[PDB]
Amino acid sequence: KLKLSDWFNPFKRPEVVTMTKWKAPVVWEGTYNRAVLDNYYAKQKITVGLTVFAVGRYIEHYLEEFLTSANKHFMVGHPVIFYIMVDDVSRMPLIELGPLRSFKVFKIKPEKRWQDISMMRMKTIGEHIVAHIQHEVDFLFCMDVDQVFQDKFGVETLGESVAQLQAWWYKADPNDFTYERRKESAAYIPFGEGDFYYHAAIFGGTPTQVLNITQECFKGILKDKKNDIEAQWHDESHLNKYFLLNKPTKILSPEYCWDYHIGLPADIKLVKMSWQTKEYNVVRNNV
Ligand SMILES: O=c1ccn([C@@H]2O[C@H](COP(=O)(O)OP(=O)(O)O)[C@@H](O)[C@H]2O)c(=O)[nH]1
Ligand SMILES: [Mn+2]
């Protein structure tokens, strides 16, 4: 029965949004007491999971760097299981893992369109939750592979449902967010609505919550298909609709998923994860 103020002090970061109107914390560098949390979670003997997909040349371009950096920086001090989904196991980089890390690899079907590779993750993650992850971990993160951990990404990020503020939009007004705006899409969010723009590169929660996130997003994806529409930002559009309806119980600041193309402004104090430069001419095979 951890209490928010046990570990979270919004006053340490007075110039950024630290609490939502539904009283979920927005976790910024300086606001969290990791020691308090490491002790608490170690006493419950938690395990944390991490899913990552790499299909096609995303394997060679990003998977090693992702996993090497995750080994070093993700939930250090707690058992972690990396679940790696690839279309060709023969190209899996098999790095050395450190204390309290282990992994397993699964072969998946490569979808033809990169858009569908990205969106089908929703289906696949749920399948894996039901079959095994629910029995293996207390919390799970689902992440894009095209990014690199830069510093500690620890238990301060854990919660029932966890969303990532997207780096380019965190100070914007909702009517500037790139939600899907066509009412024919299941991902539709009208003008005048919206809390934040969440990044689909990182989301998480307990296995139960992540099952519901992924299942509801995939239902939307499938519905759109039947209506011959494809959301503007694919699974991210659906994820944003989900989290509008089912508010996240924790949000991570853009420090947890930063685009250095923006530079490094005052609000980004310690970067925990950075985007890789895009290489679509090589890693994608369709428009
Ligand atoms: O050809 C594909 C396209 C997507 N992905 C996976 O789906 C994620 C989402 O796609 P992407 O990162 O390209 O989207 P962006 O962040 O560039 O919008 C990637 O990080 C990979 O984990 C992949 O493995 N191969
Ligand atoms: Mn990405």
CA distances from 196 to 134, 157, 183, 184, 259 (A): 28, 18, 19, 22, 17
Question: Is any ligand 1 atom within 6 A of the Cβ of residue 233?
Answer: no
Question: Is any ligand 1 atom within 6 A of the Cβ of residue 54?
Answer: yes
Q: Which residues contact 65 (CB under 8 A, 6 or more apart)?
A: 148, 276
Instruction: Please report, as a single letter, which amino acid is at residue 251.
Output: I
Backbone φ and ψ for 41, nearest 5 degrees, come out as -75, -30
In this structure, the residue with its CA closest to atom 7 of ligand 1 is 118
194: left (phi over 0), alpha (psi -120 to 50) or beta: left
In this structure, the residue with its CA closest to atom 2 of ligand 1 is 114
Binding residues for Mn(2+): 144, 146
Confirm if 30 and 12 have CB atoms less than 8 A apart.
yes
Confirm if 218 and 123 have CB atoms less than 8 A apart.
yes
Backbone φ and ψ for 163, nearest 5 degrees, come out as -120, 155
Confirm if 203 and 213 have CB atoms less than 8 A apart.
yes
- What are the residue boundaries of the structural domains of the chain, listed by start? 1-287
CA distances from 35 to 8, 53, 179 (A): 12, 31, 37
Nearest ligand to the CA atom of 234:
1
Q: How far apart are CA 214 and CA 242, in angstroms?
A: 9
Domain covering 1-287 in this structure, CATH number? 3.90.550.10
Question: Is any ligand 1 atom within 6 A of the Cβ of residue 74?
Answer: no
Confirm if 25 and 31 have CB atoms less than 8 A apart.
yes
Residue 188: strand, helix, or coil: coil
Q: How far apart are CA 200 and CA 190, in angstroms?
A: 19
Question: Is any ligand 1 atom within 6 A of the Cβ of residue 143?
Answer: no
Quick one: which atom of ligand 1 is closest to the CA of 284? 1
Please give the method by which this entry was determined.
X-ray
User: How far is ligand 1, taken at its centre, from the CA of residue 81, in Å?
Assistant: 21
The string of DSSP letters for 206-269 reads -HHHHHHHHHHHHHHHHHHHHTT---TTHHHHHHHHHHHHS--SEEE-GGGSB-GGG---TT--
Which of 86, 145, 277 gets mutated to test ligand 1 (max ligand atoms within 8 A of its CB)? 145
End-to-end C-alpha distance for the chain, whole angstroms:
49
User: How far is ligand 1, taken at its centre, from the CA of residue 39, in Å?
Assistant: 35
Q: Which residues contact 190 (CB under 8 A, 6 or more apart)?
A: 181, 183
Q: How, if at all, do strands 161-165 and 139-143 pair?
A: unpaired
Q: How far apart are CA 84 and CA 66, in angstroms?
A: 11
